[PDB]
C-alpha cells in the first residue's frame, strides 16, 4: 500500500494548506450560528475523501472520520458537503453555508482546488501492495481543535514539548484492516512547525509509517522516563501537552517515552494514524484499564469509537514493562 500511503501524504499537506490558509488569510481568519472551525474540520475530510477516490476508486466508501459531511447554516438547512468537480460549483456550495460571503468562498476553494505536488522519494523506492477490500481509514482533519482556534504563535518548548500553541495541531490519517482491526498505516501533519518571525509563512513537517505482513518501514526522524499528559489529565518527570495526536507524535519523535491518557474521550481517528507509525517503530498503544487488571487497541469494531478505558502510548515494549512495573 505503498502507492496509496505516498498518496495520503500529498492530502495531507493539501489538508494543511487548508489549516495555515484559514490562518493567515485575512477574511478566513476573521470567521447556533456560523461555525467556521466545523466548516474547516468537515471540507478538509471532504477533500481527503474525494481526492482517494478519485485516484483508488472504491475507497471513498471506506474513507471515515471524526466530522459528518453535513452542515447546517444559519437559516436552517441542511447542506450535503460535495465538492467540485469544477471551482465555480464549490463556490456555490460554500456560500450557502457562508450565508453569501463570496470573498470568503473564494478564497477557500483556491486553496481547495490548489495542485500539490508533496513525494517523499524514499517511498518511491518501496513497493508493497495491500488489497484495497482490506483497507479502513479514520481521518482526523484537523486534531487540537482549541489550540487552533486561539493560535498562540509564541510559546516556548518546555524540554522539547510544547504545553500548548499551533505545534499541537496534526492532521491524522490513519489505516487499518478491516478483518483484524490492526492499524496498517499512518500519516501524522504537523502544518505548524516552525515560523518566520519577519515573514510570518508557517512551515509544516509529515510524519509516515507503514507496518504490514512484517514489513515495518517509517519516515527519517531528526535527531534530539519521560511521560507527556494532557492539561485536563487528574490520574496519579512528566509533561503537559495540548492535542491527542501530538503527544502520541512526541513519544514518536523520542521526546517522550509514554503518553498516558485515562478517560474515554479520546477516539479511533485520534489514535489510529499514531498506532499505525508506532508500530513500524516497535511500539504501539495499550488499553489503560486493561492493563491496570498487552492488549493493543483495535479499529473495526465499535464498543462507539471511543477508547474507553484509556490507553498507553508506548515506542518501547521494554519502557513501557519499565514504566508498568513503577505504576
Ligand atoms: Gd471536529
Ligand atoms: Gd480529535
Redesign the pocket.
Given at each position: 500500500m505503498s502507492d496509496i500511503l505516498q498518496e495520503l501524504l500529498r492530502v495531507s499537506e493539501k489538508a494543511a494548506n487548508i489549516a495555515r490558509a484559514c490562518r493567515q488569510q485575512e477574511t478566513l481568519f476573521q470567521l447556533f450560528a456560523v461555525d467556521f472551525?466545523?466548516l474547516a474540520?468537515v471540507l478538509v475530510q471532504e477533500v481527503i475523501k474525494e481526492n482517494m477516490e478519485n485516484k483508488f476508486p472504491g475507497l471513498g466508501k471506506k474513507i471515515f472520520g471524526?466530522?459528518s459531511n453535513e452542515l447546517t447554516n444559519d437559516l436552517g438547512e441542511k447542506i450535503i458537503m460535495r465538492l467540485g468537480p469544477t471551482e465555480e460549483e464549490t463556490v456555490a456550495l460554500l456560500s450557502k453555508v457562508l450565508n453569501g460571503n463570496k470573498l470568503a468562498s473564494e478564497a477557500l476553494a483556491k486553496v481547495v482546488h490548489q495542485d500539490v505536488f508533496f513525494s517523499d522519494p524514499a517511498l518511491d523506492s518501496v513497493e508493497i501492495n495491500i488489497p484495497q477490500d482490506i483497507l479502513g481509514i479514520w481521518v482526523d482533519?484537523?486534531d487540537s481543535?482549541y489550540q487552533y482556534i486561539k493560535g498562540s504563535a509564541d510559546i516556548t518548548p518546555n524540554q522539547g514539548i510544547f504545553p500548548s500553541g499551533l505545534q499541537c495541531v496534526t492532521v491524522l490519517i490513519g489505516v487499518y484492516d478491516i478483518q483484524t482491526g490492526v492499524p496498517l498505516m499512518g500519516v501524522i501533519n504537523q502544518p505548524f512547525v516552525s515560523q518566520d518571525l519577519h515573514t510570518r509563512r508557517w512551515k509544516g513537517q509529515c510524519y509516515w509509517g507503514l507496518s504490514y505482513l512484517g514489513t515495518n518501514i517509517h519516515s527519517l526522524l531528526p535527531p534530539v522516563v519521560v511521560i507527556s499528559t494532557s492539561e485536563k489529565e487528574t490520574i496519579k518527570r512528566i509533561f503537559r501537552a495540548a492535542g491527542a495526536g501530538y503527544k502520541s507524535l512526541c513519544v514518536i519523535l523520542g521526546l517522550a517515552d509514554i503518553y498516558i491518557f485515562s478517560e474515554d474521550t479520546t477516539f479511533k481517528w485520534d489514535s489510529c494514524a499514531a498506532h499505525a507509525i508506532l508500530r513500524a517503530m516497535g511500539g504501539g498503544m495499550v488499553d489503560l484499564k486493561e492493563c491496570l487488571e498487552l492488549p493493543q487497541l483495535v479499529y473495526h469494531v465499535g464498543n462507539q469509537w471511543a477508547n474507553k478505558g484509556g490507553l498507553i502510548a508506548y515506542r518501547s515494549e521494554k519502557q513501557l514493562e519499565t514504566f508498568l512495573s513503577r505504576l
Amino acid at each position: 500500500m505503498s502507492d496509496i500511503l505516498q498518496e495520503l501524504l500529498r492530502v495531507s499537506e493539501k489538508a494543511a494548506n487548508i489549516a495555515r490558509a484559514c490562518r493567515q488569510q485575512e477574511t478566513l481568519f476573521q470567521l447556533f450560528a456560523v461555525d467556521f472551525k466545523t466548516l474547516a474540520d468537515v471540507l478538509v475530510q471532504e477533500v481527503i475523501k474525494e481526492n482517494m477516490e478519485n485516484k483508488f476508486p472504491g475507497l471513498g466508501k471506506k474513507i471515515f472520520g471524526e466530522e459528518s459531511n453535513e452542515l447546517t447554516n444559519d437559516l436552517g438547512e441542511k447542506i450535503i458537503m460535495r465538492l467540485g468537480p469544477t471551482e465555480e460549483e464549490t463556490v456555490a456550495l460554500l456560500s450557502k453555508v457562508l450565508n453569501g460571503n463570496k470573498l470568503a468562498s473564494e478564497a477557500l476553494a483556491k486553496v481547495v482546488h490548489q495542485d500539490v505536488f508533496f513525494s517523499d522519494p524514499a517511498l518511491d523506492s518501496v513497493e508493497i501492495n495491500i488489497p484495497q477490500d482490506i483497507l479502513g481509514i479514520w481521518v482526523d482533519p484537523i486534531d487540537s481543535t482549541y489550540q487552533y482556534i486561539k493560535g498562540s504563535a509564541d510559546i516556548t518548548p518546555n524540554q522539547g514539548i510544547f504545553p500548548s500553541g499551533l505545534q499541537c495541531v496534526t492532521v491524522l490519517i490513519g489505516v487499518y484492516d478491516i478483518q483484524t482491526g490492526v492499524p496498517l498505516m499512518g500519516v501524522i501533519n504537523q502544518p505548524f512547525v516552525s515560523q518566520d518571525l519577519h515573514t510570518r509563512r508557517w512551515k509544516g513537517q509529515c510524519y509516515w509509517g507503514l507496518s504490514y505482513l512484517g514489513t515495518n518501514i517509517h519516515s527519517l526522524l531528526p535527531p534530539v522516563v519521560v511521560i507527556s499528559t494532557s492539561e485536563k489529565e487528574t490520574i496519579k518527570r512528566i509533561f503537559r501537552a495540548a492535542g491527542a495526536g501530538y503527544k502520541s507524535l512526541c513519544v514518536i519523535l523520542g521526546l517522550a517515552d509514554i503518553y498516558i491518557f485515562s478517560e474515554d474521550t479520546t477516539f479511533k481517528w485520534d489514535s489510529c494514524a499514531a498506532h499505525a507509525i508506532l508500530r513500524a517503530m516497535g511500539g504501539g498503544m495499550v488499553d489503560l484499564k486493561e492493563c491496570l487488571e498487552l492488549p493493543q487497541l483495535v479499529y473495526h469494531v465499535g464498543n462507539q469509537w471511543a477508547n474507553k478505558g484509556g490507553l498507553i502510548a508506548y515506542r518501547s515494549e521494554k519502557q513501557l514493562e519499565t514504566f508498568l512495573s513503577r505504576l
